[PDB]
Design a protein around this nucleic acid. Structure first.
Ligand SMILES: [Cl-]
Ligand SMILES: [Cl-]
Ligand SMILES: [Cl-]
Ligand SMILES: [K+]
Ligand SMILES: [Mg+2]
Ligand SMILES: [Mg+2]
Ligand SMILES: [Mg+2]
Ligand SMILES: [Mg+2]
Ligand SMILES: [Mg+2]
Ligand SMILES: [Mg+2]
Ligand SMILES: [Mg+2]
Ligand SMILES: [Mg+2]
Ligand SMILES: [Mg+2]
Ligand SMILES: [Mg+2]
Ligand SMILES: [Mg+2]
Ligand SMILES: [Mg+2]
Ligand SMILES: [Mg+2]
Ligand SMILES: [Mg+2]
Ligand SMILES: [Mg+2]
Ligand SMILES: [Mg+2]
Ligand SMILES: [Mg+2]
Ligand SMILES: [Mg+2]
Ligand SMILES: [Mg+2]
Ligand SMILES: [Mg+2]
Ligand SMILES: [Mg+2]
Ligand SMILES: [Mg+2]
Ligand SMILES: [Mg+2]
Ligand SMILES: [Mg+2]
Ligand SMILES: [Mg+2]
Ligand SMILES: [Mg+2]
Ligand SMILES: [Mg+2]
Ligand SMILES: [Mg+2]
Ligand SMILES: [Mg+2]
Ligand SMILES: [Mg+2]
Ligand SMILES: [Mg+2]
Ligand SMILES: [Mg+2]
Ligand SMILES: [Mg+2]
Ligand SMILES: [Mg+2]
Ligand SMILES: [Mg+2]
Ligand SMILES: [Mg+2]
Ligand SMILES: [Mg+2]
Ligand SMILES: [Mg+2]
Ligand SMILES: [Mg+2]
Ligand SMILES: [Mg+2]
Ligand SMILES: [Mg+2]
Ligand SMILES: [Mg+2]
Ligand SMILES: [Mg+2]
Ligand SMILES: [Mg+2]
Ligand SMILES: [Mg+2]
Ligand SMILES: [Mg+2]
Ligand SMILES: [Mg+2]
Ligand code: NA
Ligand code: NA
Ligand code: NA
Ligand code: NA
Ligand code: NA
Ligand code: NA
Ligand code: NA
Ligand code: NA
Ligand code: NA
Ligand code: NA
Ligand code: NA
Ligand code: NA
Ligand code: NA
Ligand code: NA
Ligand code: NA
Ligand code: NA
Ligand code: NA
Ligand code: NA
Ligand code: NA
Ligand code: NA
Ligand code: NA
Lengths: 73, 237, 56
RNA sequence: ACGACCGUAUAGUACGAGAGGAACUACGGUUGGUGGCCACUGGUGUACCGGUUGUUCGAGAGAGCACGUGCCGGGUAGCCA
RNA sequence: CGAGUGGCUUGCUACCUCGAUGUCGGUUCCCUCCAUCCUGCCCGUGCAGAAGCGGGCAAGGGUGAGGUUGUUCGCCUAUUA
RNA sequence: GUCGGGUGAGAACCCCGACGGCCUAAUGGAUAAGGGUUCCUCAGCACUGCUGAUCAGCUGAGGGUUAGCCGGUCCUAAGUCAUACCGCAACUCGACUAUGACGAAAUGGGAAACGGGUUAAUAUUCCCGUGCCACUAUGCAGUGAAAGUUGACGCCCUGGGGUCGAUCACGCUGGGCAUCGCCCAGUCGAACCGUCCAACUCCGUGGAAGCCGUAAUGGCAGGAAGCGGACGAACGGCGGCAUAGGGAAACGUGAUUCAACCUGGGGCCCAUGAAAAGACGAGCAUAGUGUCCGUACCGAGAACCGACACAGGUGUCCAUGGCGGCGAAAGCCAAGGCCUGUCGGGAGCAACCAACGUUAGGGAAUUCGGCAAGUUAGUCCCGUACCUUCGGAAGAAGGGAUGCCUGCUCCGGAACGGAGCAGGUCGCAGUGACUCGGAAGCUCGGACUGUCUAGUAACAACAUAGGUGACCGCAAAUCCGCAAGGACUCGUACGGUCACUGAAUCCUGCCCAGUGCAGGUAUCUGAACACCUCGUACAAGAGGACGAAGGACCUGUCAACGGCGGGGGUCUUAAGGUAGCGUAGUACCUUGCCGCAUCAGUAGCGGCUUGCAUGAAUGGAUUAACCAGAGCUUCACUGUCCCAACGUUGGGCCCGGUGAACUGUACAUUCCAGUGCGGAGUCUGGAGACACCCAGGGGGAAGCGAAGACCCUAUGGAGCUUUACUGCAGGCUGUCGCUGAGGACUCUCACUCCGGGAGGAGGACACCGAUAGCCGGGCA
RNA sequence: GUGGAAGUCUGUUAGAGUUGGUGUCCUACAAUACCCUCUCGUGAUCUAUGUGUAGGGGUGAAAGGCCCAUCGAGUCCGGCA
């Protein structure tokens, strides 16, 4: 997490960094298969180390509140 | 005095230009004779240097290989379709008319065929509201209601990479690396921090603008700075 | 660093060279234009009236 | 080329109700200044002698370099205070 | 109230320099003035003595160390004849 | 550097030898740029060389650079040019669009060379030997041939393979030393041809429900381990090359750590890390061809730039030579280079100065200020406060240890790797030199790293993330261009432009009267064209009607410019200072008052505070961390001081050689006074004064240096500003022309945009040309 | 325990920078130098080469800084006696 920043940048700044990055680094459930092996490949790029599926997702999350509203509509 | 920074920009010199030669593709909708038959498969997901968002590489039936503005949810292997009869799933492109009202859409054309202009940045999306034989009313991310030719093609879904803005750059260094991938002079020196000769706000024994900051729309370039034709300022009220 | 002597050291670049057209060492090899006869910019030879007193 | 102060005896005296408290003179010392000197103390002393780290001359012996002594210990003369 | 002396302060003047007389404070080093702070010799005293107070002659010598302040000045300490 | 010696008319510095030194990322080796013959040889000294010269990068003459396989050449990069088109009064000018060309010599991509020998000077180029590449021709094979692969790629961490080097063991060859028995050198051998293959990927078998595996992550019934196999690496191993070559000789063998080279795994991105030629894909023999340009040398304290043989500046590669140690550090030493950071001789060598060592007692008394100097120091063990954004503060502070010698233990495969143990033992001192933090507290500022006045300012100034406001739906906002056109933009509001504030934390009050910007507007004001009236056989001109933007007027708006008082228990002018903070880096009075601290404190800190003249994104308060930022206190330390001394090195002084500059109206041995345009060596009066020379520190020549920056003057200049004067771009708006059909409206045909086209949108508007009104320090 | 993040720390590694000495120099070695001291040193880093922007114009993390010893408007020549 934020620990790399030492005592720099202030609370809000780094707290949102850990938060964003903890969610960012969580185990994510693959869309193709059902396994929790999705890892961020780059900015908005996600892949499943299991089946190798490469998906277009949020920047720091595979699914964005809005991406989900799409499915329904 | 000397031209202010806004005036140097116009000249389009190196410092101000965007690293075009480093860009990948001009994401635009394909051209289909008609029929809609046109389909293709997602071969790969690449990062777009010009938009700091993902972009999908697609191989079409007729051999055409082109990059595409990828909406959230598109992966490798997926099959995308483009045309009047395209299915109604995310990633597919078809005129606003064939699109069902109430569905999120991105990369909308202003006039049919222009290849898409509206809603293309990270995680944004338009909202098709009203249909008609004549007009297609779409709400752009700015919140505006845009009356459009129901013929204008658009892509289903929301643009990929949503949430980019949620994380702070944290440090100059990070802005630096981003700015270098854009057509912008950075960092920014405050006018009020300059000399009279260099900016209408420059000069004084202390820093403060000379006159009020709201300037008339008619102001000439060189003088047009600060709050442009502001309809109001501040937060109060 | 001083803009004088200490900045004279880096001057190991070649610019103005012998001009194929007029023979003066003014052919700017980066510009491919002669500062003396205009070779590389003008078919006509470089010449101005201020090169001499107005009445002469 | 000497200026000034403190102390002792004078004296707990003269004076004074008392409290308190002189001097002339003779002495001893301090301070500042002055001129000189180096037995004594002290400083220096890359003269000298020893200790010892690293390295090089194979080891030893004996040495060089480490800013114009590598460092440390002692220090004669002379010059000094 | 009246008469003066000095040329440290301030003010006034605009004589001298604008083809430049390097502006404060300090420091270092030298000479001087006396309207004398100490020291020598004196006078008066509301001079018992001791300690003072005032005044005279007198510039040989001395007149030091520090705390704040760039400070001069001055404020303050402790020594001091 | 010294002693000998050589050459020579002449030798401190030209050459040989010895002795003594200097350089170790350079003072060595290879080179880019740049220079341009400086390279080699002979002959010289009038020039050049900080003295001299027999020397030379000097003078003169000769000579020297050899390539199919090293570069160029070729390809394409940012980008550049030419032609066309278009603009412009016009061009040698100018943007776009086409086409073509140009654009990389160390250091981008790239068909192919190694070893030895040779010259005074070249050398992967010549010679000897061996090898390789491309193209073409002949022949055999092949009919495959274009899909694909490669060229071809970021930053951080990391495993394995592995050569050189270094080191260790042992053998051989040669050398050194001479109490020992050690110490040093060598022990060689390419391109290429052939062959082997770890890693990754994949296949079969197998059949794990908990096993497999890593330095770490990880892997699996979507099939784990194991077993067998396909593909598959080195500038590497192995064989040939090689009774080639090289060596006086021997002409080794194993090992560890392993640069190069090869091959993997992991992690990061609001950052995504060239392209094209070419190569492969796609055999073999023989033969022929492989032209053209570069090639010397320097590459720097004398061959480059800096006027100089300039203490400056100037890119790449050698980062693996030894001891040392964490180390590409110090220090010492090899190889290699050098004694040319090029004037010498002499005096115990004075004063004075530059660098520097040591100073007793005291210990910041010095000073604006501890400026300067000093103290501390490496490693391990213990131990560690306030505060804090919980990260940090922290190496806090403080305490202890530290060498050598003997014999061992533990970790590891092992190191010539690391951690410890017991005993013995020397010194004043064991990180023994070298290397190597002094520590603590309070206050101010800016949050942090970062930026800056090349050449007196590095800061508190700028930047920054973060906060905030503004403009814009893209035929946009903003900006460049005279135009043709263009940047932003291979972009699309999670955008980007234009501004303010400047991390975090707690917060950010009241005011729209003025000014600014914006919106609305009955009425008022508001130009020109067209229209009406008068006038004129026309015209000038006068007037009327209509009325755009704009203004009046009204409203909104202060994280917009800015404001937040006097008086009384409202008045100016809208409001009348809220939270905080406060004698402030803001406080005139001021050394404010009280306290702390000191012998004494215009300082510092805390409290008070009526604030000459604090205060909320002109941001307020506050704040951990950080700081060559400002002030203050303490411990430690000390030649800063009391108060100076002695010493070291280079100068200084004497001698040989070389050899300037500044400055000069004249006269000139002055001193005390006076006088004078009131600041005199020169006048006047006196005093003093024999001439010359050496050294000194600089009193005076209002010393030398600069036609005073201060100040004023000039109907001087320039930059800058604005509600100064006059105008000029630009924006908005009305009108005319392009412009067409049937105070509001439809259409399509020009014209514009979108679409490849069909066609779609828009449409007589817009654009453009002309003109009128308003705004108009953007500019003159 | 492993892992090895960081506009992270020490650091004369290379390299970059330039705080104090107001030292040395100041007719210099130098029209911006020398020495000691000091800062940064995995990044908004440093650097070579190529290449773009030109004078009321550039460029400027802004100092009126910089644009060949030239900058509150470069340099050259002309207007110009
Ligand atoms: Cl951004
Ligand atoms: Cl070459
Ligand atoms: Cl691995
Ligand atoms: K004057
Ligand atoms: Mg595009
Ligand atoms: Mg933002
Ligand atoms: Mg980050
Ligand atoms: Mg850029
Ligand atoms: Mg800024
Ligand atoms: Mg400024
Ligand atoms: Mg202005
Ligand atoms: Mg401000
Ligand atoms: Mg300059
Ligand atoms: Mg020595
Ligand atoms: Mg003078
Ligand atoms: Mg008297
Ligand atoms: Mg006297
Ligand atoms: Mg020669
Ligand atoms: Mg000769
Ligand atoms: Mg080319
Ligand atoms: Mg190359
Ligand atoms: Mg040679
Ligand atoms: Mg050569
Ligand atoms: Mg020389
Ligand atoms: Mg002492
Ligand atoms: Mg003091
Ligand atoms: Mg004092
Ligand atoms: Mg110091
Ligand atoms: Mg073991
Ligand atoms: Mg030490
Ligand atoms: Mg203060
Ligand atoms: Mg700062
Ligand atoms: Mg400066
Ligand atoms: Mg600084
Ligand atoms: Mg400075
Ligand atoms: Mg901001
Ligand atoms: Mg912002
Ligand atoms: Mg700031
Ligand atoms: Mg106070
Ligand atoms: Mg406010
Ligand atoms: Mg402000
Ligand atoms: Mg006379
Ligand atoms: Mg003058
Ligand atoms: Mg002036
Ligand atoms: Mg003027
Ligand atoms: Mg078009
Ligand atoms: Mg003006
Ligand atoms: Mg760092
Ligand atoms: Mg550092
Ligand atoms: Mg460049
Ligand atoms: Mg200024
Ligand atoms: Na201003
Ligand atoms: Na008088
Ligand atoms: Na004068
Ligand atoms: Na003075
Ligand atoms: Na006296
Ligand atoms: Na005082
Ligand atoms: Na010589
Ligand atoms: Na091989
Ligand atoms: Na070593
Ligand atoms: Na840094
Ligand atoms: Na107002
Ligand atoms: Na207003
Ligand atoms: Na205020
Ligand atoms: Na800094
Ligand atoms: Na000393
Ligand atoms: Na003098
Ligand atoms: Na000016
Ligand atoms: Na852990
Ligand atoms: Na320095
Ligand atoms: Na100009
Ligand atoms: Na002229």
């Amino acid at each position: 997490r934020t620990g790399r920043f030492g005592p720099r940048y202030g609370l809000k700044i780094r707290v949102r960094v850990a938060d964003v990055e903890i969610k960012h680094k969580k185990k994510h459930k693959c869309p193709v298969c059902g396994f929790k092996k999705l890892k961020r490949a780059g900015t908005g790029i996600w892949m499943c180390g299991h089946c190798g599926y490469k998906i277009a997702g949020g920047c720091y999350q595979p699914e964005t509140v809005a991406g989900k509203a799409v499915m329904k509509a | 005095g000397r031209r202010i920074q806004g005036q140097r920009r116009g000249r389009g010199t190196s410092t101000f230009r965007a690293p075009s030669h480093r860009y990948k593709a001009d994401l635009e909708h394909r051209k289909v004779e008609d029929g809609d038959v046109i389909a293709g498969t997602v071969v790969d997901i690449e990062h777009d240097p010009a938009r700091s968002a993902p972009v999908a590489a697609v191989e079409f039936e007729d051999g055409d290989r082109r990059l595409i503005l990828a909406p959230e949810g598109v992966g490798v292997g997926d099959e995308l379709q483009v045309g009047v009869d395209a299915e109604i799933a995310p990633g597919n492109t078809l005129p606003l008319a064939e699109i069902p009202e109430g569905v999120p859409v991105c990369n909308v054309e202003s006039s049919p065929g222009d290849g898409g202009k509206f809603a293309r940045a990270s995680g944004v999306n338009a909202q098709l509201l009203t249909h008609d034989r004549n007009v297609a009313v779409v709400k752009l991310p700015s919140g505006e209601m845009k009356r459009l030719d129901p013929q204008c093609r658009a892509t289903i879904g929301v643009v990929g990479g949503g949430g980019r803005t949620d994380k702070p750059f944290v440090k100059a260094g990070n802005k630096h690396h981003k700015m270098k991938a854009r057509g912008t002079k950075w960092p920014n020196v405050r006018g009020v921090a300059m000399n009279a000769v260099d900016h209408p706000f420059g000069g004084g024994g202390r820093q403060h603008p000379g006159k009020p900051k709201s300037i008339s729309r008619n102001a000439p370039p060189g003088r047009k700075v600060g709050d442009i034709a502001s309809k109001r300022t501040g937060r109060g009220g | 660093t001083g803009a004088g002597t200490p900045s004279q050291g880096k001057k190991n670049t070649t610019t103005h060279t012998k001009c194929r057209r007029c023979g003066e060492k003014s052919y700017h090899t980066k510009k491919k234009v002669c500062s003396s006869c205009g070779f590389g910019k003008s078919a006509k030879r470089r010449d101005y009236e201020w090169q001499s007193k107005a009445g002469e």
